[PDB]
């Protein structure tokens, strides 16, 4: 399956001029564009080699669209201050995300369009692409305006149509980087914590895409109660890293197996501690 | 490619 996502952050800056506006575009777990209101270019910029092929018509249009969104969000910061009876003295944040998922056949699976204000859900397009979830009374005002103006109809045309057409174009043009899998390189480490117990840490390195499952078993039974799993983290080269740990009795290391599932593996891996 | 929606909150 595949996704295209855009992420927008708009932050008011009391007494320091215009709000900060940052936009980033992803296909799956690969960033391909950025815009930053504070950068010198004032253009949508490439962040993957495969999007650099797109010509001036693409770059001028994406620049015009991202700057138009920054203008909308500058007004929205003001509107949200009115709805929540907030002064200009405070810094506030609007977050916005939209995009589309497709299946293995590159056919539409679902669409997203949602906003947060100051880290909380504000308004979201429901999964049926025809109705809104308004998280509070402020967001109900927005919801009523968007119902009266038939916003869902025009947004649905983008999410089901245009968004999928872009994703297919990008999946074709970037196929060498976007349609690849890098299977995890795995190893285990051992650390004494007491005289009577030790940590086994199961490592997954250099994998793509980010989606992975690490599971610990004791005698073939999932240990999800007593496993610590760290957030999947970027290596910085376009691949990801993760580890899962368990505390075990010293002398009983070989009762435990680590299980790794990843798109890039024909079969799940099973690791066990080796002196 | 980006959405072209003109809708304000």
């Amino acid at each position: 399956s595949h996704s295209m996502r855009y992420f927008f952050t708009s932050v008011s800056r009391p007494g320091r001029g215009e709000p900060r506006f940052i936009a980033v575009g992803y296909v799956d777990d690969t960033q391909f564009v950025r815009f930053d209101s504070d950068a010198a270019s004032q253009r949508m910029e490439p962040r993957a080699p495969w999007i650099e092929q797109e010509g001036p018509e693409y770059w001028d249009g994406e620049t015009r669209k991202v700057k138009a969104h920054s203008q909308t969000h500058r007004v929205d910061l003001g509107t949200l201050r009115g709805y929540y009876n907030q002064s200009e003295a405070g810094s506030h944040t609007v977050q916005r995300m939209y995009g589309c998922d497709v299946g293995s056949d590159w056919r539409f699976l679902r669409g997203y369009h949602q906003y947060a204000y100051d880290g909380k859900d504000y308004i979201a397009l429901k999964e049926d692409l025809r109705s809104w979830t308004a998280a509070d009374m402020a967001a109900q005002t927005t919801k009523h305006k968007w119902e009266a103006a038939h916003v869902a109809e025009q947004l649905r045309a983008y999410l089901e149509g245009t968004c999928v057409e872009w994703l297919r174009r990008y999946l074709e043009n970037g196929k060498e980087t976007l349609q690849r899998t890098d299977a995890p390189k795995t190893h285990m480490t051992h650390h004494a914590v007491s005289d009577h117990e030790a940590t086994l840490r199961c490592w997954a390195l250099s994998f793509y895409p980010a989606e992975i499952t690490l599971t610990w078993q004791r005698d073939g039974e999932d240990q999800t109660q007593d496993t610590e799993l760290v957030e999947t983290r970027p290596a910085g080269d376009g691949t990801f890293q993760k580890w899962a740990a368990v505390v075990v009795p010293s002398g009983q290391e070989q009762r435990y197996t680590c299980h790794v599932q990843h798109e890039g593996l024909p079969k799940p891996l099973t690791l066990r501690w080796e002196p | 490619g980006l959405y072209d929606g003109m809708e304000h909150l």
Partner: T-cell receptor
Amino acid sequence: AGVTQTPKFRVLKTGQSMTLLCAQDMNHEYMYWYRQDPGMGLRLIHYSVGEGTTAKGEVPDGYNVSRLKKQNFLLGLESAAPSQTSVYFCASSFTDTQYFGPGTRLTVLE
Amino acid sequence: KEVEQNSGPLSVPEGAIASLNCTYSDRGSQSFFWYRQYSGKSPELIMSIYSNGDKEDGRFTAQLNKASQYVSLLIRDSQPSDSATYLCAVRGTGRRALTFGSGTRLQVQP
């Protein structure tokens, strides 16, 4: 009200000045001034995406605009020329669906 | 040039289909509108369309073909009261304003 325009009709001598007033009571961020002449259809003069911002349309030359207040969009003719003889329509939108005012017929004579 | 319509006039007998056609240059355009204008009156929205395909509203059908950059309005069972100028409007890529065609005059003969 929807979208209102004043005046409806005006004759000007070449070199006289006037302001056309567009008002809307719908809380629309977007407002538009057009002219319409036989052969040419509607041509955008200036538009505004919100209070305190304006932008040039297709035929901005000889016209100015202001949007000091969200509810009003003013079109200014500093020095009327016979070429500015036209029907002027203003419009507003919440998104891209435009609602038009009733039009202002202007004739400029020597 | 950005939005093309034939001026007509297009003459059709009462009860025939009227097909009003429009083409546009900007391939990324996301919004398309048909307005009706009676002589001496304001443009009035009759249809909007966003997705490739058909949209029906009483005797009106709009059809959009994005690959051919072609949009149509069909009036079914055309009536003398449909006699008017029909304006095609398109919103280009990243645009915050409509571009109008110069319109097609429809004359529906009783």
